[model samples]
Target chain A: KFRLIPYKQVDKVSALSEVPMGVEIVEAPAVWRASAKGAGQIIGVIDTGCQVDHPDLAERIIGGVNLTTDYGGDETNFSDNNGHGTHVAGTVAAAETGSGVVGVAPKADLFIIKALSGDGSGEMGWIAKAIRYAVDWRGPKGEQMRIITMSLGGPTDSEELHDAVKYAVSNNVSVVCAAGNEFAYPAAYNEVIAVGAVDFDLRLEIDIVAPGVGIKSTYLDSGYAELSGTAMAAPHVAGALALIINLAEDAFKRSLSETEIYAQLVRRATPIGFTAQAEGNGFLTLDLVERITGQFTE
Target chain B: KFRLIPYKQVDKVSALSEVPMGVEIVEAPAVWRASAKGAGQIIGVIDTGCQVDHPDLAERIIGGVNLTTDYGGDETNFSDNNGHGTHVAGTVAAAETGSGVVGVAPKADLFIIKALSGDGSGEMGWIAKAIRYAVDWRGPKGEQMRIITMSLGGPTDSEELHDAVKYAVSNNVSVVCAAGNEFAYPAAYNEVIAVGAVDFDLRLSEIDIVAPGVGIKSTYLDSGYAELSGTAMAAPHVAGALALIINLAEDAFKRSLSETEIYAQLVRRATPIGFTAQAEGNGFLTLDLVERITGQFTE
Candidate 1:
């Protein structure tokens, strides 16, 4: 009788029984994962609010601004529900290594901008304000965020948000957003680079999708968990923009243009043979960072 | 004299040469990326046609059938203009790698059913035929497709389409379609999952949204270029649903509720969130595809 051995069992990576206090298992996009490996960076966590001092995603976080009238600190007071914003923050800049979780851009510094409060959902005015604030925000140590990650969106195109985006862009602030969990809206609008979601395997789930499935990251407290919506996916691209912008700045005499930078980022995407109907140019590539800006120095 | 070092800059990537063959680039939402990746796995692409063999997407393809009376062997002839079908296709199954693009379930396999012709967009009967065909589809090698995607909507809700969905679900098949990119109709029916687009990028464009966007995608003898709008995104969700159900087979047992399966697929991942105040679900996920089916097939 032939011995039976389940054909290459799909790994025994058991779902965490209880991740340690400071441990998070975020399924971050590979591009950001590559960014985190290289150096210490800053990514502002702008959302409803965050639980600072959480065991997993606090040490690498900073700059908390409360868009919430009910909250206190810039970040500590931001409460979330749509829970999209908090998840976005974790995906873009979560701290990791010990736990199996990793962010798209580890070592990234965070600036928490709590514009929306419920479920991480809110109005356009706060979002616009958040953009402007994120553009010129200077951390306690006097450091500014290179990118303003905007994951929130509304149906109406707000002149305020556009102005803020242009303002941030002019200030060398790279902005990004979830193309909108909805097929239309914010992501479709071109003022900022709308980010889509993808899975860990680099397969195309949607057009221009970033790694979005089973993504693990930090929560309100120093605690960590997983996020799997388009809301959770936008931050990956935002963080990638920051890392690439930094890489570009370090190598070139000046920063790249919005078009140039956007193009380069798009150029670096891994070709996954996706229909424009399915995937845009291709899947995003972390390794492409090296190809475009080799030997870049800070 | 002081030495100065350039810190970090922004927007550095350059454009590629001519949008790449069979691949057309457009301006749309970047957030749709992930939904596209995950949902694409389940939404089925049923429209004018699809570019089955474009360079960037020559691979990652499966299943296709032309419902047109005209004889054409382009089992993979995907090209569209009057710009409707392709727009719908992109929102459902565009590839989701980190690149500049738009879509919902970018990673899902596309099961193509040419319900609308290259010229004739077609009538309710066309959609009915496609729905029936989709329910009974068997892969070239005989694999059961799970969901049926549709972007077309009509004023008259054909009991045929609804019944077909019921039939499809009975066999673990689900049907998802656009809520009507323009005016709501069949999409407004309680039987369907409606959606709307939000052009609210905090940036250069206006609120820039609708039931659909200038959605683009790869299609046609590898022509790989197409774009259209209105409830088109919903069809992709239908396709996304199929992929989700099919993937779930390995995990869930006791399959065999075709109509119920169809209803569950729509209600499962469909993003319950509705901008219904502004538009139907405001591009909300086919709902069923995003919520439950999503969890069941998370592995």
Candidate 2:
């Protein structure tokens, strides 16, 4: 489960650097260096908003909506509100060509929903509204937000949130959430995909861990910063979804159904869990994602 | 020169099933977590403010101040305007005894600072003011906020702000800052402990990294919330600083150098900077914060 490491080892990240194989990882999507390149998938970072105009994210921001006030405008206007939205958006899909931090699905199209305020808290109603909107949204190209990545979450035994989540799941939208920093009751709803934290080394504990610790990405200010948490944990799954979906983007080439993508993620995960128990499957891997889709066959 | 898989494989954290062997995690706060229960380290989170009375964090949150201008009295009147502060506070030091979401320093005290507005944007002036105020504060027991964490930033690389940082550094204070989201320029400052983000599979890319990943204890909102940042990641390193420092609380053999304390925390106890020559440092981890300082050995 959770073994307390020695303080000296704390600085030695090399100690625990052994994540399972078979998972896929796109590393810094920001450094892709190809303008025509993108994840070929669209992920909606349901948070504050986006910089919409950020040089790194200028083009990839297909179109988003500001759900904080239920107003309708540039959803990618994630430039404000403590800068949380923009950072999340950048992680989900900041333009990579420019010298900016990149997401797993670098070049992946993005849709930001300002469900949380600058303080990073949001009402249940607003969140629900954003979820449904994100699922139903149609990009400028008439494409809808393929997968919805929610880094923030609250207690989820509530039927109200469950109903919203179920709607997305049923509609084929993957709803991912953070296992949270504190270790208590995580969102128990089975329909929702819950992600836990793990070191970059890929050790296991509690819930399925993602890179929730000491992570650097877009933030509320100064353009970029670092943070952690279950919120940070969820994006791994979201990015995996994009990586998986990108394999079948052609649709005519045996497009992977939403369910198939979710299942593939499990198969590719490093099977990590702890007494904290809440871990789902295990640490995710881009390699497994590729294998499942047979995309690596080439 | 590097690949994602190489980053993941080098750390021994690929699979979540078994704890890797010979896996000397060069970057987690493992030593600190093993050393201390995070007794009295105070991490100041400057953001909107917190649910001072939130059942989860109430115990650890001694007090806070609203730097949002003319708030007058009620230094304890911490209310979230945009909810960003609450989340940031939750990430830095949310009480985590099975009550709610955990924070980086589960037992560390929290000092809330409201520098930005509800919309999350604030005048650079206010941020500078908040930094000065946080540096000026004395701990609940007169220990003072040895580690200050801020989640907001601005374009004005004002010399005044640098002065504020200098003031904190002089007072034995360690300031931890979040690198901006997309591009990394301004946050590239050396004054504060700047953080980045990464993914679950141990893939260290040019971007997409954080102070620590996978189960780091920081803030998590109680009500409905969305995901935070990837690189503009979690805000709990300040808590990590406290955990690393106070691990030897029982030994009484403590460290007094503010910057040293900060280094012992973020720098000393991180996941080795494999992507070195580029990465800020190593990843974050609090597992051994207790062990490291008590013995003063990262071996």
Candidate 3:
């Protein structure tokens, strides 16, 4: 069985007047200044579900599917009974309205795929099925799913799950998954880009580290909460990739291959003075990518 | 004229049994674990002068010269009267004697070059002269001076001072300097690795990287250790970090690193701790991080 990477709720707040530190640390505001707020990107988030009516997330929630049995796998009722999916969604693309906490890619759309149940636990089959569904998902106006992010993982490796990840990457939809609090499958799969956690203060078998500690985002009941885990880290990279794709593709005037996009993400990462195994490519940053694109277009 | 970068005295302690936090934060011990304790590295410290007999610094003070007129420019009387130079030297290469404070590169040698008077002030010509002397100085065993660190700076820039800095760097001597509490010269000059101050809690132009500066405890006057804070204290950490890096890089690459190459390694090891580029530059210094990267090349 897979779980939601075991995140701890740190605090609850009424609203945020400024962007969260995790979002700022990754330099997302600089990317937004360049007018690349993930405008045309749609990230498929596979988790518990989302509060479709939450003020911070309402406008960014394009559409979703409930793959779990919590609501009988209803395509219409993808409402989040557990809070993890909504929190993950908020980190990826919460709205940039004046009164609430803003996400990394505030203008991007999120396609919520509910695979885990209300208890934050699910079977391998539900997750594998959700990955396949997200890869093939399309909006009414032909908006293709550009990225699929999962914050859940387990110790057991499933051939079905691995193939689902491979199938998504084979279709050009970048599959971004969590490396878990420890080693786990799906993230362990070679096809998906595995993201590990790094704090403001400052682990794992991972490709790169992002701000995961003390992350404040939208929660259940239209509220906000702070959580920490590798689960919180994956969506940051997913959101950052959306901005990278928009800006990088625009600079080259062509679509980027999955490998090309991955290269951009790793290349822009600023090493945080940790070993290669500990920090991988380094801490993720949008400022470097923004600078590179500026020079390219100049 | 140049003034010591203003520092604040925080506290006085009887003794410290363990290594100070600033030394640990830079991961100096990990480099020590690798048996690279800055041996054979001689850093030219240009400041007020040193005690020459302080327990934490005596063994490391290989030689000295007083360029200031305080002691009639005596070659043998480089004794510290204001205490700032001793503290700066301690942060760089104070000995690891197991009883008191330890420096960042404990085994490194110090060539004390006193350019400033007891009032922590000096003329532009005195500083410029000191730089040329250190760059041209030689050890008894023919050990060349590898780094020249200056925690002093001024508002005015002199052509003579700039050329002296240029000459030292042109000779492959890595010049590490303080960016002051704000903008100040020598540090403002392009020839030096201008280091700014960054506390464990967490500005200036041309700051290449930052280190632990707040409440730093190191060797002071009268052979005692006291806590002080400023970019003055921050500069020596890099000076010593460079000492360790030179030995480590030389052992790994089988050749000496130039001033430019050393600067890149220093910037490469810095970790951005959530501050802007202007405030933290490339970020905080981490020696072990660079060691790990260098190890990859060796394999």
Candidate 4:
């Protein structure tokens, strides 16, 4: 029954606070100031349905798709019934509301792709469709899509999902996937950027760890919840990419290529562990993003 | 509206795993071997309701109560409607289920007192009633309530609650309370043991030494698990440590020690962390050190 393990354990915590720890870990504050506040960027969140009306996420979520029959309340019933997708989306683009928690890329836009059902289970084909849509999706005025975040994975590798990831990456969109609990999946695939979990101690067990433990984000019913896991780790990378790309493009006075952005992200990550497998490059945050981007522009 | 924190930040981490690091930090395993597995000990968990049916916790939950109009379903309704109580219970008594996580005092029985609502917020009157009940509760076979674990506290100090805590302590029931998020509460009252949080870095701001409060893994609602933080995290460690101390003292003397004796043994075990007595009362909970009390207090 414990198929997906949320990386955090709350029997450990108690409080009422702001911004949560993950944002500070990723150094989102520096990114917010250095970049366009992720204004020019857009992240395609592919997971369970999203809470389209969530106050923290509503502004950033422009549009999305509902691939499952269970969530067919209306044409736009892509709202998160499961809460996972909304949580992931919030991490990528929860707006700066000044009172509640904030996302890593608070100004970035979101495109919700409801591939997983309310039970947190979904078909490979539905995921494939969502991935394809995220890659091809353009804003109302044809705005370019900058990144794709997927916080869900299965034991078996779906060829369809793999192909879709390839499609998105080939189109210059950075695809981020969760390195599944106790295993790997779309995250393990070569074409996508795989993420793993890390706690306050900075201990990790896979390529690229993030604040996967005790992360508070948007949830179902327009409320908030604290969760943990590699599922929470993947979006930090996605949000970091939004910040890095926004700043890099703004500095270069031109849109940086996907490869260019990917290289800088790897180079800018603050390496903690000795091995590459444990910490792909390092922890992703805006502190290094600002320094690296400054070095590039100067 | 503050929904969104990312997972990639963990990419910053480097390691291998099982059970969050807090368990090892408290040195719980060594204590279990050093003394009894908390047999004959009962900890009153005063907080939100519990999942009386959670597999990891069902065995240790000896009894409980529901004092409000909020949680009234059936016999099973006393279960942790709010995940918080269940998580606290798990840390105080989650057993070594072979394939899952364990706690500091796995064999210590829990008396769950549901005083908070599902949102983790509760009325003061309800909390007072819960504390009194935990102190007054008796085991099925007339077992004594050795410890009262209160992981919840509020900004306003209720005189009624303070009196209840004092009553419990005077009655030989040790009341352990959270020092609170920023300030202090039932924990600061001087009657109950005021517990506070300390991260893995071992750095603390205003509370007693510290325990593994960040990213601590324990049981949650619907048979799930999660990590949390705050003074809430520190109290359970102390409560579990007390249970172990009581068993060790009893084993050595063939009788339970007075609450005064037990509290002192725990204080003696606390290694200071370069903080004032007000900040870290005693220090990080040291179960193994307190385990030595078996010899010192033995008649």
DockQ-based class of model 2: incorrect
Give candidate 2 misplaced runs (Cα > 4 Å).
A1-38, A70-78, A182-186, A203-207, A248-252, A272-278, A289-298, B1-299
Residue by residue across B1-299, what tens digits does model 1's lDDT show?
Answer: 00001111212222222221112111112223323344324345566765554333334457667765434635444443223444445545555444433344455666666666655365566666676777677665566556666555555655875676656544655555454322343454443444344222211110001222323232223333443323343244344434444444222322333333233323322232323223322123332222211122112
* DockQ class, candidate 3: incorrect
- Model 1, runs deviating above 4 Å: A1-40, A72-76, A79-83, A140-142, A182-185, A201-207, A220-223, A289-298, B1-299
Candidate 4 docking band = incorrect
TM-score of each: 0.43, 0.42, 0.52, 0.47
Top candidate, metric lDDT = 3
Q: Kindly list the interface RMSD, in angstroms, of each predicted candidate in the order they appear.
A: 19.9, 19.9, 11.8, 26.2
Report lDDT (Cα) of residue A237, candidate 3: 91
lDDT, candidate 4, at B286: 57
Candidate 3 chain B, which ten residues in sequence have the lowest lDDT sum? B290-299
lDDT of 2: 0.52
Tens digit per residue, CA lDDT, model 4, A115-149: 77777776667778878888787767998786987
Name the lDDT value of residue B70 in candidate 4: 72
Evaluated against the true structure, the overall lDDT of model 3 is 0.80
Q: Tell me the spans in candidate 4 whose CA falls farther than 4 Å from its real position.
A: A1-17, A73-75, A205-207, A289-298, B1-299
Query: In model 1, how large is the Cα lDDT of residue A55?
Result: 45
lDDT for residue A257 in candidate 3, whole number 0-100: 57
